[model samples]
Target: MSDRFVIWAPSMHNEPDQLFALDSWAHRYMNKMDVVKIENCTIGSFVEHMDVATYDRMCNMGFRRSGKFLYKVDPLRNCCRLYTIRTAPQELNMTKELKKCISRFATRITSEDYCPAAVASSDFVGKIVNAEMNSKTFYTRFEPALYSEEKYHLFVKYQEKVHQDYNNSPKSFKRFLCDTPFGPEAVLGTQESWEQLNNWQRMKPGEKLKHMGPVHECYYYEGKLIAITVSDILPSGISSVYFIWDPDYSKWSLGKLSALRDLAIIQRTNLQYYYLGYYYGAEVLDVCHSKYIPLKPIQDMISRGKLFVIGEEETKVTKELYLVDSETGRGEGFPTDNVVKYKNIAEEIYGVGGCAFKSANESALELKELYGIPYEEEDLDTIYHNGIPNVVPGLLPLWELLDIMQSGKITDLEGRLFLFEIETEGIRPLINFYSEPPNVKKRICDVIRLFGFETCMKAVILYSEQ
Candidate 1:
């Protein structure tokens, strides 16, 4: 075990002894062993703002969570969490009915929402399901953990058939393997490049980051590598599932399959939470992953059935939250399936400290502000641009903007803020959020939300879609 120190604190709300400044240790999760100490960060301050488990993962070569609490700075990395149903808890005796339904899940390989072998490809290109799989067997996220070697190999063959043509965009392909970024577009394109390549390329083979969740590659049919999904394993119970899959197979609903497989894996594993990427992010797959499964999705797959995520029963709001076996991914239903209700809970719903917000509005705002268009659909000359120059160069927390906006503050955030939000529902996500003005940030968000306790806020974001 690594040595972890902590400073004094009354609670999430009470003033912390020393304010955490967003520094290098605070900025990119880099260790501040520098004997020449740039800022006055104490051992206690550093530990409170961070956790020992995350540092442990870094030792295993996993990505780190840096930046202010309003947001995180997640460097590009391979390996994501695999979602599963709670086979461990259910005494999972594969029921004949479920086995029958899932065994034939992939019958046609065309429709998007069938049991298997089918795809509910995104509706944009043409809602019609018409992907062809060269007669090879297919595998979902569940296939491997179940250990079906024969089918896995056959699935690989299916991928080989369509693999060559998939690289139609060579320029786009080269960009993904970038270790050094050239510019802002280069950085975003790196993400584009990573997801474009097949799964094998996305992950560094045999890179062991224990408790660091899942790493995946999708085959054209079953075993063929067509896409990649990578994410970080948290010290906490949650697993943030970042995705990168081939867009050419978007016609086959490959993204949806990847996420669905993720949830199924989460269920199979005993972990309580699965951080399924961002909600309504660029080319999102949340809806297919949680909402449309045969059973009702968790409230954005949140604290299902529990009154409050980390609270006592008296105050829990039954509507926005529900229950899940966690072990099986089988979750309790929302009060109703009204899309609007789910959407509201996912976006506006907040427990104690931070709140859920639609990326739709923020995403649109990002586009409009960057493109120089006044909130209207623009012409070909719109000249789109996006790079968080103000937010400490790369991806930092949103609240950091307040300082730069007003004081143009750009310092290392050691104990500045602590926030965590997820898209388990429609807009928000499964994880809760908190900000410690300058103290360690752990357990506080959980304790505050359910107890209806209040954590001090420097500021809250305000933006709307165009």
Candidate 2:
């Protein structure tokens, strides 16, 4: 297998405490309490190289990709509870809404001039497939995510008219949709298979045709582009990234039609799941057939203050940290002596007032005082303008490095620290634990904590200028 490395770069939205304060439109409706106005928190990394299996594993762990960046929302803290939703297309029951959406689109197409004879079939799948194959007025094409003037124009129109986003451009469009981390050769399926699927032909009589990878499925009516569904075909399922449609066809419910088409693709391609991005709001769940799974255990660990890196070896640890409140005498201690043992290890490695001892408010106060940057709704632009680095999984926020750098108090970082430099050819050791200063050691620890030990061992850490 080829080597995979995460290009851990400086990110603005890594403050766990500040995330709750960020302005969010859905926050008001999502939460009943009026204390906080908004909340949308996530930690992300820009992966330099990734394989399908790694991406699949990350997905299972609640990470979603936007372009080349992989991110997972803080489910416990985010205002809107976004669940990773998916469905088995083979097991999906054609609901009334699904039936209605298909009939509505099919009926409209049939009514158009010069449209092919409507397939005399009751099965929704059969009718949809038959129309794409035999019809003259309505058909769809599935192909690689390559750029074209026609696609760009349709995208611009969709953004301007449908979304009211008038600032559409080719660069933004390419970055959001056309670009992907997966190599061309890495994706499953070939031109031949795509051609076969597009031509309504199967590889074998009973065998399903294979077409997996980042793709653009364009829906055309009367030889005009009307809608586009950008998706990633993974080993287990198809993940819908984004969809756009012409506003003129809003009556057809293209959004529902596109989802149905994706489900149909999964069913026909013999894939097991159809990942429908994230499902927001609890009330909406009542109407959808998708299985909603909580991004949990990870969330539980984060909430309980159990998520941390342990020891000189940098072993990733997740366990509940039971607080012993002396005043109330109400809290129970940990089950064993692990609390003391792990606390000692964390303190030794990270020092006092580190991630182990500081509260969110304390951290926020330090950032506000030291940098004159308050992590409030109004201060977000300033925070971004200053280019604050992210605080990944078990790492301290790079903002903390400022104090360490200015202190000039040289001290040991508890144990042996190894730093690797990412080179054009391959990874190589940059420095040893004994030789590095406190500031460098802190940065190294941040890098190790950001990516777990296994990945750090394989990856070459590249520090970027903020």
Candidate 3:
């Protein structure tokens, strides 16, 4: 079989015949193997809040990431998406609602805008609370939802029995853009660092990185860092987003507030996604991830009605079958059936080694001479200014690189790719067209299987640009 494919269609300015004519441009150019980089993939974004390098590997494994300003990708696509916040005008009404909540919770707020000139120090936060807050009185308030009638009344009855714990002082503050590891232990249990690691880190089987997107860090009135939300920003899809917040802000509805702010940022930046993360549809654990977000749950992504990110442009590459004498950057190599084939062919042509999870036990010599898998002595290059492997750690040992990927819970290494089955058919994500929609997604698993290198399924993270 041939290596790569390209599909082209019309823009708003074209008619049907014109669009059909445009298809010929792709048809005429469709060739064997790419002479340069493979053509069926989109590039990545440079948002500061993202882990771009880790995301790059994720895209290669079949999962797509969000791109553009404050956007993530949803390759499987999404449906029943609803957007809540669009501008400061919407927030002004929200501010009015906050006024009522402030009183009901008997809490004070630091309602100042997040001006760079603002002093958000501990001392400043101290004064934002009531004057009595300075007293050594230790008090805690349970969220109205944290309790039903069965348990909350006991808390209310004992509310008057409050006292101070001098050593149990409050915490210091934080700002936007903090590191969150995102593993099962951290997400599900309290044992951090070593506990509840995934298959990627353990180097076991059945672990894969689903998707890596941008996360928003919301600042708080007391100068303390409050919430963190990770969501996918994709073209014309319900971006899947997840959130974690400080208990203090629970009463303030900071989770929703953070979602609203991120959504506004998405719209302002010219993206149409506001993925509210995943929602598991099970009540057995008393957790309903779907209830918090507006969309229905079906385990993983779906392709219902059309979800298209606007302004995505496609690029093409030509292939050469025979060996070409050139350096890695010279865009030289013997051609293969796919990008993975390129990666395999690269190992033989370049004399490098890959500690690939599934094929690790096989000797490098045997795999290289017998099988075809691509390998580069250098790192995968991209435009992300702050991507992990920072600057694509080329010349580094593949073992160490795999370690970093494992540490980041990248069970899969996928590049954001797009492929065309037929010209004028329009390019589609390969996995979405092939596999049945998944039921649920969690921390990445499934190590032995190649995650994102399917023939038809390329990464979506690359296609999402405004």
Q: Against the unseen true structure, what C-alpha lDDT does each candidate score? A: 0.27, 0.52, 0.26
After the best TM-score superposition of candidate 1, give how far the Cα of residue 373 lies from its true spot, in angstroms. 39
Tens-digit lDDT track of model 3 for 1-466:
1122111210111100111111222233235213322112222222222233333322222233322222122211111221211122122333445444433323343222322233222222112233223323222221111113323222223222222212221110111122222222222232221122211122222332222233333343444445444443233222333344555445667645554445444433434334332321211100100011112222121222211111112321111011111121121112323333111121111111211221222222232233222232222221111111111111212333233333642323233234332324454443321121211010011111112223112222222212
Give lDDT for model 2. 0.52
> Which 10 successive residues of model 3 have the least lDDT summed?
283-292
Candidate 1's C-alpha runs over 4 A off are 1-70, 73-105, 108-136, 140-223, 235-238, 280-466
Q: How does model 2 score by TM-score?
A: 0.62
Alpha-carbon deviation at 224 in model 1, angstroms: 2.6
Candidate 3, residue 297: the lDDT equals 27
| Whole-model lDDT, model 3 | 0.26
Off by over 4 Å in 2: 1-3, 9-41, 110-123, 187-189, 196-210, 280-426, 429-457
lDDT of 1 at 102: 32
lDDT of 2 by residue, 292-379 (tens): 2222313332343222222323453222122111211111112333333422233222222233223333444554454443331223
Model 2 vs truth, CA RMSD: 11.8
The TM-score values for the models, in the order shown, are 0.28, 0.62, 0.24
lDDT of 1: 0.27
